Symmetry: none
Subunit: 63 residues, 12 copies
């Protein structure tokens, strides 16, 4: 009768409606990174890092 | 009868309606990183970092 | 009667409706990386990193 | 009566409807990597990294 | 009565409907790698890495 | 009455309907690798890496 | 160049989002007529009568 | 160049999102007529009568 | 160049998303007529009457 | 160049997504007539009457 | 160059996705007539009457 | 160059996806007539009446 995990609900998306009417959508980049329009996204992570809609232009490194 | 996790609900999105009417949407970048329009996004993270809509132009490093 | 995992529901997406009417969608990049429009995406990760809609333009490395 | 895994439901997508009416969709890149439009994607990972909609333009390495 | 795996359901996609009406879809790249339109994709991975819709333009290596 | 694997269901896709009406679909690349349109794909992997819809343009190696 | 009907837009509903969270909805009548909850309703009528959400309990007639 | 019907748009519904979460919905009538919950309804009528969500309990007639 | 019907769009429904999560829906009537939940309904009528969601309990007639 | 019917679009439904999760749906009537849940219904009628979701309990007639 | 029927599109349904998850659906009537769940229905009628989802319990007649 | 029927498209259904997961569906009537679940139905009628999903319990007649 310990009930450590008796009911959990974590990282959950439910019941989403979405309408997008777009007469002209233009995404043109140079040298860069564009993220457009994610919907109903739901992750869980135990012991780690999570970047859902991430966008980097440059990543460098030295000694 | 300890009930450590008797009911949890954490990091949850539910019941979302969204309408977007866009006659012209133009996203044109150079050298950079644009994040546009995330919806109904729900993560959980145990022992880590989470940047949902992140955008960097430059990341460098030295000794 | 320990009930360690009596009921879990984690990293779940359910019940999503999506309508997209797009008369012209143009994604033309040079040198870069564009992520467009993910929907109803749900992962779980134990001991690791998860970037769902990630986009990088440059990744470098030195000593 | 330990019930370690009595009921789990993790990394699950269910009940998704999607309509996309696109009169013209043009994705033309040079040198780069474009990810367009994933839907109803659901992974699980034990001890590893998962990038669902990832896109890189350049990956380098040195000593 | 240990019940280690009494009921699990993990990495599952069920009940997806998708309609795509596309009068003209053109994907022409040079030097690069484009991923378009995956649907109802569901993997599981024990002790490994899984990138479902991944796209790289360049992968290099040095000493 | 140990029940280590009493019921598992992992990496499963079931109940998918998909309609695609495409008046003109043109995928012409040079030097690169395009993945278009996978549907109802479900793998499992014990002790290994799985990239379902992967696409690389260049893979190199040095000492 | 008369332009009798150059542009009309009449009886039009567009761009509506609605969320209803109802823990208990009970409609029990005797002898009568209940109309509950219409949304995004738009008619036009030339030479006639239109009652959109109408409800009558009794209608009689004599000589 | 008379342009009697150059552009008309009449009796039109477009771009509607609706979410309804109802834990218990009970409609039990005797002798009567209940209309519940119409959505995105759009008619046109030339020379006639239109009652979209109508509900009558009794209709009688005499000489 | 008369253009009597140059462009008409009348009685049209387009772009509707709807999510209904109902844990218990009970409709039990005696002697009567219940209409529940129509969606995305669009008629046109030239020279006649149109009742889309109509419900009558009794209809009588005499001399 | 009269153009009586140059472009008409009338009585049309297009682009509808619908998700219904119903744990228990019970419709039990006596003596009556229940209409439940029509979706994406679109008729046209020239010189006549159209009742799309109609429901009557009693219809009588005399001299 | 009269163009009486140059382009018509009337009574048309196109692009519909529908998901219905129903754990228990019970329709038990006595003496009556129940219509449940029509989808993507589109008729045209010239000189006549059309009742798509109609339901009557009693129809009588006298002199 | 009269073009009476230059292009017509009337009474047409195209591009429909439908998923129905039903753990228990029970339709048991006495004395009556139940219509359940028609999909993608499209008729045309010139000079006549069309009732697509019709259901009557009793039809009588007198002098």
């Amino acid at each position: 009768v310990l009930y450590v995990g008796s009911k959990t609900k974590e990282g959950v998306v439910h019941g989403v409606a979405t309408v997008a009417e777009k007469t002209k959508e233009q995404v043109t980049n140079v040298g860069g990174a564009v993220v457009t329009g994610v919907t109903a996204v739901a992750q869980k992570t135990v012991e780690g890092a999570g970047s859902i809609a991430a966008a980097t232009g440059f990543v460098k490194k030295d000694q």
